[PDB]
Write an enzyme that holds these catalytic residues in place. Structure first.
Site, short mmCIF file in Angstrom:
data_model
loop_
_atom_site.label_atom_id
_atom_site.label_comp_id
_atom_site.label_asym_id
_atom_site.label_seq_id
_atom_site.Cartn_x
_atom_site.Cartn_y
_atom_site.Cartn_z
NE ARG B 65 77.45 41.54 86.89
CZ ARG B 65 78.58 41.94 86.32
NH1 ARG B 65 79.25 43.00 86.75
NH2 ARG B 65 79.04 41.27 85.28
CD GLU B 102 82.28 36.79 78.29
OE1 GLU B 102 81.24 36.17 78.01
OE2 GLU B 102 82.98 36.53 79.30
O1 LIG Z 1 79.31 47.66 79.04
P1 LIG Z 1 79.35 46.23 78.61
O2 LIG Z 1 80.65 45.82 77.94
O3 LIG Z 1 78.12 45.80 77.83
O4 LIG Z 1 79.37 45.36 79.95
C1 LIG Z 1 78.58 45.80 81.07
C2 LIG Z 1 77.58 44.72 81.42
O5 LIG Z 1 78.28 43.51 81.72
C3 LIG Z 1 77.77 42.95 82.93
O6 LIG Z 1 76.64 42.14 82.63
P2 LIG Z 1 76.77 40.60 82.16
O7 LIG Z 1 76.41 40.58 80.72
O8 LIG Z 1 78.10 40.05 82.57
O9 LIG Z 1 75.50 39.86 82.85
P3 LIG Z 1 74.89 39.77 84.36
O10 LIG Z 1 74.07 41.03 84.53
O11 LIG Z 1 74.09 38.49 84.23
O12 LIG Z 1 76.07 39.63 85.29
C4 LIG Z 1 77.32 44.14 83.73
O13 LIG Z 1 76.37 43.79 84.74
C5 LIG Z 1 76.74 45.06 82.66
O14 LIG Z 1 75.35 44.78 82.40
MG LIG Z 2 74.56 42.90 83.46
#
Ligand SMILES: O=P(O)(O)OC[C@H]1O[C@H](OP(=O)(O)OP(=O)(O)O)[C@H](O)[C@@H]1O
Ligand SMILES: [Mg+2]
Ligand SMILES: O=P(O)(O)OC[C@H]1O[C@H](OP(=O)(O)OP(=O)(O)O)[C@H](O)[C@@H]1O
Ligand SMILES: [Mg+2]
Lengths: 178, 178
Positions: B65, B102
């Site tokens: 993202r 997670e």
């Molecule tokens: O601060 P944290 O607890 O590490 O979470 C924040 C991260 O979680 C989400 O990414 P995600 O891993 O869901 O992947 P994506 O970028 O593929 O949506 C978001 O885009 C951040 O990169």
């Molecule tokens: Mg991310």
């Protein structure tokens, strides 16, 4: 074209990645050189405006490398960018579509309210190879009753015949490699 | 601040995604509304110039993202954007760093030649939650001997104490939710 040269000279080609015989076209240096990135976005935007005039409503950017280009391209065109993601990533009601990736299958997904029926979209990704990813995107968009005007990429691997896979949806790439 | 309001009013909240009890902050509408997207990028750029002047060499955008914001932010600042990816995606020699995502473990990765020692970087992502992802990015950058001047996001979930996890690296978010 000197602009196109600014992009071409910033593609780094790695042999035998991820498997022997396959050449990986790395766009990272395009991103790292602001003049190159600006050139790539400008060339895509000019093509799209020259081809579609005011018909485009939205850009759709494809997870993940396509995300690097979608928003900037949309911005240059004065448009919003909608997202097509790998399945499981988006909240709310979605549609999803399978496609073939390497040796297995993967799925793309879109929020059902990403587009309304009749809205016209151009899909952007960094690279067109087999066309599987882009084809899945077109399927999803079609299922929202959006009209896909064109798909575009920075790089096209022509020996893999992605262009044909997308037909009759038009396709345009900045750079072509066998 | 009406600019900030343009961003705030385009955050869509989804309860119990992906798990019960949490609220997913969906940035999709920011991307879809070009004025909102422009505002977000502008607010981040203004903050960074106001805090670092001309000292930033590169933006680093985080897969996936974060890719939506990294190049646009870099472009607004006249800078290149380097990529930090989920492990397995980048060609060439790499370093990687594990973190808790997670219930299990994920790894970020960067090309060994992405930065030179001493180069100054600001990391951008869409959202700071636990700070695990951003922290892994900082570890990778530090292992290249790059100087992380700051990390920034659109959204920060303050109850998760991500800011503390990053300290002493400065952090800035546009919007905060518990
Ligand atoms: O601060 P944290 O607890 O590490 O979470 C924040 C991260 O979680 C989400 O990414 P995600 O891993 O869901 O992947 P994506 O970028 O593929 O949506 C978001 O885009 C951040 O990169
Ligand atoms: Mg991310
Ligand atoms: O035309 P195709 O044969 O479908 O291949 C093209 C796709 O492959 C790459 O993505 P990849 O699936 O490696 O994921 P990434 O965006 O996470 O790098 C590339 O970014 C395209 O999306
Ligand atoms: Mg991709």
């Amino acid at each position: 074209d000197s602009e196109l040269q600014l992009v071409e000279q910033r593609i780094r080609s790695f042999p035998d990645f991820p498997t022997p015989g396959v050449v990986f076209r790395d766009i990272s240096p395009v991103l790292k050189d602001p003049a190159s990135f600006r050139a790539a976005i400008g060339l895509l935007a000019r093509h799209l405006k020259a081809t579609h005039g005011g018909r485009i409503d939205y850009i759709a950017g494809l997870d993940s490398r396509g995300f690097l280009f979608g928003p900037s391209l949309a911005q240059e065109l004065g448009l919003g960018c909608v997202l097509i993601r790998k399945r499981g990533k988006l909240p709310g009601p979605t549609l999803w579509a399978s496609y073939s990736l390497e040796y297995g299958k993967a799925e793309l997904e879109i929020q059902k309210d990403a587009l309304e029926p009749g809205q016209r979209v151009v899909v952007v990704d960094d690279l067109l190879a087999t066309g599987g990813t882009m084809n899945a995107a077109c399927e999803l968009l079609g299922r929202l009753q959006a009209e896909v005007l064109e798909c575009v990429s920075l790089v096209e691997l022509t020996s893999l015949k992605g262009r044909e896979k997308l037909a009759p949806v038009p396709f345009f790439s900045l750079l072509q490699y066998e």
